[PDB]
Symmetry: D2
Subunit: 294 residues, 4 copies
C-alpha cells in the first residue's frame, strides 16, 4: 500500500492500517516530514497516535517508512479522475456494492455516500423506495474558512467562519447514489448543514416507500441488515460518541419516524457517521479487498 496525499484522510488511513493485519503500507506528500510526523503523532479529533514516530523518511514503531515529495506521479484531491492516475470510474462502498476484477482506477466514494448507501439499500430491498430527500447535519471541514474570508472556490457560505455558524451547503452524494445503487438512481436528492463540531456527522433521510411500514418494522429491517460497515444501535448517542468508529454508517433506531396522514406515509430514517474515521475505515476495507483481486 502506498499513500499519495498525507492530509486528514491519508494520516487516518495510515493509523487505521496499523491495526489491520494483512495491509501495512511508502507515503508521498510535498510538505515537510517534520510537519507531517508531528500531525501523525498528535490529532485533535482522533487522539494521540497509537505508538511512536521519529523523523530518508520517518520510522514508526521501529519499521522505517519512506516519505517522498514528488510534484507529479490517492487522497490529494488534485488527481480526481480516471486518466489522472499513474499505474465512468467504479464507485464502491464496502459491504454494499463491492461485489462489482481488473480496473485502472476505483473510487471509494464520498464520506457521506458511505453513510447513506447501506441505509438506503436496506429500504429498497425490504420496502422499495419511491423517492426521498436527504439532510446531513455535518461537522465542519478543511474547505471551510476559520474566519470570514474569500473562499478559493468562490463559495459564499464556505467563506464564513466554519466553527461559529450553521452553514448550508450542497452535496452530490444523494444524487450520485445511482453509481452505487442503480435501483435508486434519480430517486434521492439532498443538501447539508455544516455545524460547529470538528468531526462527526449524522444523515437524515425523509422518504416515501412502496408498501406501508411501522416504526418497528423499519428498525428491525436495519438490525437485520447490520454488519461490519453498517452498524446498529438503540442507545441515545450524540456526535462525540461516533468519533473514531469503524462503522461506515451507524443506524440510530431512536430517531426513526413513520408519519401516516390519510393512507399516505412519510418515513424518516437517521444514521450517524464520523466523516473522518467512518469513511477512512470503509476506504481501507475497500483498499484491502481491491489488492486481493486482479
Amino acid at each position: 500500500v502506498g499513500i499519495n496525499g498525507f492530509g486528514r484522510i491519508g494520516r487516518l488511513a495510515f493509523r487505521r492500517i496499523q491495526n489491520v493485519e494483512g495491509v501495512e503500507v511508502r507515503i508521498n506528500d510535498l510538505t515537510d516530514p517534520n510537519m507531517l510526523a508531528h500531525l501523525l503523532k498528535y490529532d485533535t479529533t482522533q487522539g494521540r497516535f497509537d505508538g511512536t514516530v521519529e523523523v530518508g523518511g520517518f520510522e514508526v514503531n521501529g519499521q522505517f517508512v519512506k516519505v517522498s515529495a514528488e510534484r507529479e506521479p490517492e487522497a490529494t484531491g488534485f488527481f480526481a479522475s480516471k486518466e489522472k492516475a499513474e499505474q465512468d470510474v467504479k464507485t464502491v462502498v464496502f459491504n454494499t456494492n463491492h461485489d462489482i476484477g481488473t480496473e485502472t482506477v476505483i473510487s471509494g466514494a464520498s464520506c457521506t455516500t458511505n453513510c447513506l448507501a447501506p441505509m438506503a439499500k436496506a429500504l429498497q430491498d425490504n420496502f422499495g423506495v419511491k423517492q426521498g430527500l436527504m439532510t446531513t447535519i455535518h461537522a465542519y471541514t478543511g474547505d471551510q474558512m476559520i474566519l470570514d474570508g474569500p473562499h478559493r472556490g468562490g463559495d459564499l457560505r464556505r467563506a464564513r467562519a466554519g466553527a461559529a455558524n450553521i452553514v448550508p451547503n450542497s452535496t452530490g452524494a444523494a444524487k450520485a447514489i445511482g453509481l452505487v445503487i442503480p435501483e435508486l438512481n434519480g430517486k434521492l436528492d439532498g443538501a447539508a448543514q455544516r455545524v460547529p463540531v470538528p468531526t462527526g456527522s449524522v444523515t437524515e433521510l425523509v422518504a416515501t416507500l412502496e408498501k406501508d411500514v411501522t416504526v418497528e418494522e423499519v428498525n428491525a429491517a436495519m438490525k437485520a441488515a447490520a454488519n461490519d460497515s453498517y452498524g446498529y444501535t438503540e442507545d441515545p448517542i450524540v456526535s462525540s460518541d461516533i468519533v473514531g468508529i469503524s462503522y461506515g454508517s451507524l443506524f440510530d433506531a431512536t430517531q426513526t419516524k413513520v408519519q401516516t396522514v390519510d393512507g399516505n406515509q412519510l418515513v424518516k430514517v437517521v444514521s450517524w457517521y464520523d466523516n473522518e474515521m467512518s469513511y477512512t475505515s470503509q476506504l481501507v476495507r475497500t483498499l484491502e479487498y481491491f489488492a486481493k483481486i486482479a
Copy 2:
C-alpha cells in the same frame, strides 16, 4: 402609548425590554422579578449573543434608571400582589411559569410566553382571531413563530397533505454544559450541549394546529441541537395537493412576506440572523422540489433567531392586543 409590565425578567423578558426600547408606542413602566436586581441589571447591560445594551443602566432604590428613565423593579412572589395600575400598566408580559392574578385593581390584559383554553397567536399569521374580548392570550413557542408563516404560505397557495420538520437548533439552557446527570432523566440533554450534535424531540410541529387549524395533525418533527449559542434553521419536507416548481414556491413566499415573515435570496448563515426582527426568514436558496415519477416532495427552509425573532413577534402581539 401602550404601557407594558414584564413579569419574569429572564432571557425573553430582558430581550422584550431591549426590543421595546426601539418600538414607538410601547414602553415598559414596571418589571417584576424575584432575582437580585444587581444580577438583572448586569445581564440587561451585557449579553453574549445579543450584544451590549443600547444605552446605560444603573440600579437604584426601587428600580432601574435606564437612559435616565426610571423603571420600577419589584419582587412580588404571587402575581395577585402586583399593583400594575400604579405604574399605568395596561398589559402584562407573563414570562416565567404561569394566570389572571395580574387582573385586578392590576392590569387589564396579559400575554403568556407559552401555550390551555387560552388563544395562541403568531403575529401576521393568525392575529385576526383577536376580537378584543380576551383576558389572556398566548404568543406561542419560538419554533412555532418560525414554522407558522412558512407552513401557512404552503397551505394557502398549494394545500398541504402532510410534512416532516427538522430544526437545526442552537443549544439551549435545558442542556448540560458538560456531561452530567439530567434532572428529568433525558440521556441526550445530559451531554455537553456546546460540544455535540444532540438529537431532540419538539412538539412545535404537532401543536401548529392551535395557530393554523387546517394543518392540525398533518405536521410532525424533531430537532438536532448544535454548537451555536443562538440561531436556528427549520427544514420542512412536505407533500402538496397541487404540483409546483421551485420558482412558484419561492414566488409564493415572497408574496407572503411582511415584518414577521422575511424573504431573502442571499446565501446566509446562522450568525446573519442573530438579533433580527423577523419571526421567520424564508431562504429561497435552500428550496427543493423533487419530482420522481409524477409524485412530488417539496423541501422548504426558513431561518430564525430562537431568541430575538420570537421576542420581536412577542412584542408585536403585545402592542396590538393592548390597542383593541
Copy 3:
C-alpha cells in the same frame, strides 16, 4: 491487589473507575450511588471528552456487568449501612460531596466496612491534603481520612516544588487558561451563587474567575505558604487546561537550566515534553502535570529576573490519575 470502593459515581467516580481498569494492583469491587443504574452505565459508556468506554457495560440486577466481571452497585443513602468488606473493599473513594469532613467520611469505617477513605473535597485542617509524588511522604499510615486535593493544585504543585528545591522562590503570580466547568451556565442566566461571570455562556466566552489553588499551595508545600497567588481565564474547550507561573527566584538562572531541572524532577505524575503540543493532546493523560519546555521564558533586564514557567494538565483525567495513585498507595499502609 488493592480492592477499591467508590461512593459517588459522578464525573470523578466514573473517571476513577475508567482509570482503574488500565492500572494493575487496583480494582473496583463495589460502587455505591443513589442515581438510576441505567443513567450511570450510559454515562460510564459514553463520554464527550474522554471518549467511548474501553470495553462493554451492561446493566444487571444487583449491579453492572463490565466486560464479563460483575461489579456490585448498591444505593445506600447512609454510609454506615454500606457493607464494603462483604466485597473485600479495603479503601473507599468518597466522591459524593455530602461526606467531605473527617467524621462524616469516617462513617465508612466500621467492622464490616472499610479501613481508609480518600475524599475528593478539600482536606480541612484535620484532614491531610495529598498530591502524589509531591508530598505523599506525610502519610504515616495511622490516618483514617485523607484528601486528594484540588485539580489545579495537582498541576501547580510539582512545577512549584521543582522551582523551590532547585532555585528557591520569593514570590509568584499564576494564570490558568482553564476549560469551562460544570459550575458555569451554558447560556446567559442568573447564577445561583450570585457570580456575575459564571452567569455567562461558558462555551462562548473567555471568562475570568478566581481560584484559591495558588493560595492554598501551602497545605501541600509549606515552604511556599503565602508566596503564590493567582487567577483563571475559563475558555471554550470542554476539558484540558494550561497553567502559567510568572515568578521571582532566589538564584539567577537561564532558560536551559530550568528546563533541565524539570526534566530531572520528572516522574509518573510530573511529565516532561519539548513537542509544541496543544490542549487536545493532553486530554486523557495519566500525568498529573506535564511540563512544556517550549513556553519557558527567563527575562533578564538589569540584574533582576522574572521566570515564566508553564505546564499542561487535564482537569478531568490528570486529577483522576493522581487520585488513583494516592488511593493505591494509601491502601498499602496501615
Copy 4:
C-alpha cells in the same frame, strides 16, 4: 479626507464599516484581488461584527453602498493603482504583503500601514511631515495605554505579558500543514488552547521608548472567533496598592483607553471603539516580604478595537 483601502480582509472591511460612522472620513476606492461578489457579501454579512449598517449591491466596476458608488480595483503591485483618480489623499495598506517602507510607498499622498517607519498608537504617541507610518499591531494597541500608565505614575522596571487571544485566519480550521511551518498554528484553531509567540511586547519600545527591552510576552490562542484579553505581570519602581493602580488607569482613560469595574467577559468587548479597555476587577498587587508583583489586565477586540484605533490614526494623519 478621502480614503483608499488596499486589502479588504477583516481589517480592511471593518475599517470601511467604521469609517461610515466617522464625520469627515470617506472611502472612495478599494483595491483587492478577490471577486467583488465575494467581497460585497463579506461586507454585508459578518459573523462576529453583525450585519452591515446599510445596503450593498455589486455593480459594474466596484459596488454601490447606500446608493453611492465605491470603485473596487484588483491591481497586484501598489503602483498602477491610480488612487488620485478617485480623489483619495491617504491609503490604508492592509494586505500584509507590503509590510515595510519602500514597499508601502505607492506614491505616484499619505500611507498608513497595518503591520509594525514611525509606529503610532492613537492617544498614546500620536504627538510624534511623514509619508509612511504604522498604526501598529492589534495587541500593541491594547498594551500601550496600559503600560504607559504604569510608567508615568509608578515607573516600570520589568514585565511579562500573556494575551489570551481569539483565534485568527492564520490558524487552520482543522489539523493540517501550516504554510509557514508553525506546528501549533497547524492545529484546529477553534478546538484547542494553542500557545503562540508574539513580538508586540518586545516591539513596545517603538511606541513607548521608555519601556524598550523591558517587556516580553507570549499568547494563548483560544476558541472564540474574536475578542481578546491581555494580562501583564510586572515589577514597578514605587510600592503600590490595588486601589492606587485602578485610580491611575481611570485617570488615564480617554477615547482610546477604556476603564470599567464591571465583571465583563470577551463577548462584551466585541465591536467596541476603545483600543484598550482596562478591567479593574482583575487587578492584583501581590506583596511577599517587601517585594511586589503587580498584575494589570485589559480587554480588547483584536478586530474592531484595533480597527477603531487605526481609523483615528488615519483621520488625524491626513489632517497634518
